[PDB]
Design a protein around this nucleic acid. Structure first.
Ligand code: DUP
Ligand code: CL
Ligand code: CL
Ligand code: CL
Ligand code: CL
Ligand code: CL
Ligand code: CL
Ligand code: MG
Ligand code: MG
Ligand code: NA
Ligand code: NA
Length: 326
DNA sequence: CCGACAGCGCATCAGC
DNA sequence: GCTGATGCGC
DNA sequence: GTCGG
């Protein structure tokens, strides 16, 4: 956190541009600058020094000079004071309320937690659950709880079919000491890129986790993605654990390595890595790495037997999950 | 200058 | 119902 | 907002 003040500022600006301005490219630019600065091993002394880093331009360099000189940014100071911006930024903290819905709600004069709660009938299913657990979803998950959660998920999945493999990915796999949620990658030999020899593969797992009262709510559910809510069981006379977000992704077993690379992240590491692939003439998604033709049309999937294979194609030295937290 | 910015799953909606 | 566009989030 | 060509 050598540059915590600056990265915080950039993140606030990123959030402003996404939530309020609905300028998604400015949002991404700011997050990229924060990320490159976050890993810079020196306490930044000036915007010029930061402008050396890729992704920090002239505008951000000026902002860093203001911030360094004064400890603040007038631009942010004004935004913080704007009722409409504040209201929109707030509402978007509810899972399922994005920039669009937030602005629509404010138009109707629904702009506090209190307002949302009194107008529950104006929320879609996802939004209702996000409101229900608003506080809980703000809390981080200690790694020690993540371990307990992993134990349950892995054991309950084994109980459904001993041929499942469940892997906890996301920030947990990168070694983080706390996570925002739990991400679980699921494979079964019946489901490959070549055929789906068993239906309800994801449904079955979700059902068992609900049966044992681990999964408590559902935000979305399809054949390959589940997004919902879970909770650890508490002991006698113990205060309950907060409800947690859980995401599960069922990937073709033969495409496990691209899948685990994707779900391990970080999001910015993936954006960086995918961008580089493109420069090298490949395209990477959660399923495959394929060459791009002279026309730009993705060719056939290249053979992948490890995460490192993927790195090798794009001429990157291998990076352990712990070193992918960008 | 200016195009491109990673790539995709599920919920919801319009239009037919 | 379908297909396609948009919102939201991974 | 930043960058490569
Ligand atoms: O925009 C995204 C978001 C997520 N992902 C990926 C990478 C990421 O690590 C993974 C899990 O998504 P999360 O939102 O759960 N982020 P993560 O687990 O890395 O951190 P945390 O959950 O602790 O906030 O899916 C993307 O590829 N693009
Ligand atoms: Cl933009
Ligand atoms: Cl500030
Ligand atoms: Cl502004
Ligand atoms: Cl695991
Ligand atoms: Cl693919
Ligand atoms: Cl690691
Ligand atoms: Mg996560
Ligand atoms: Mg997640
Ligand atoms: Na730069
Ligand atoms: Na939200």
């Amino acid at each position: 956190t050598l540059n915590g003040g600056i990265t915080d500022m950039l993140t606030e600006l990123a959030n402003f541009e996404k939530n309020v301005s609905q300028a998604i490219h400015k949002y991404n630019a700011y997050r990229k600058a924060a990320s490159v600065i976050a890993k810079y091993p020196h306490k930044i002394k000036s915007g010029a020094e930061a402008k050396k880093l890729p992704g920090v331009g002239t505008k951000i360099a000026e902002k860093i000079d203001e911030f360094l000189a004064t400890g603040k940014l007038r631009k942010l100071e004004k935004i913080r004071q704007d009722d409409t911006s504040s209201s929109i930024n707030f509402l978007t903290r509810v899972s399922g309320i994005g920039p669009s819905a937030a602005r629509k709600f404010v138009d109707e004069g629904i702009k506090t937690l209190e307002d949302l709660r009194k107008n529950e009938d104006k929320l879609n299913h996802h939004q209702r659950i996000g409101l229900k657990y608003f506080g809980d979803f703000e809390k981080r998950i200690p790694r020690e709880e993540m371990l307990q959660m992993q134990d349950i998920v892995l054991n309950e999945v084994k109980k459904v079919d001993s041929e499942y493999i469940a892997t906890v990915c996301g920030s947990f796999r990168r070694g983080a000491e706390s996570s925002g949620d739990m991400d679980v990658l699921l494979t079964h030999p019946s489901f490959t890129s070549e055929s789906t020899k068993q239906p309800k593969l994801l449904h079955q797992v979700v059902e068992q986790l609900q049966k044992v009262h681990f999964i408590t709510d559902t935000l979305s559910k399809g054949e390959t993605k589940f997004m919902g809510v879970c909770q650890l069981p508490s002991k006698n006379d113990e205060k309950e654990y907060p409800h947690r977000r859980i995401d599960i992704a069922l990937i073709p077993k033969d495409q496990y390595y691209c899948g685990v690379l994707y779900f391990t992240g970080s999001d910015i590491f993936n954006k960086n890595m995918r961008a580089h692939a493109l420069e090298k003439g490949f395209t990477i998604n959660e399923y495959t790495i394929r060459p791009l033709g002279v026309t730009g049309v993705a060719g056939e999937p290249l053979p992948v037997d490890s995460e490192k294979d993927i790195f090798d194609y794009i001429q990157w030295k291998y990076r352990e999950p712990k070193d992918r937290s960008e």
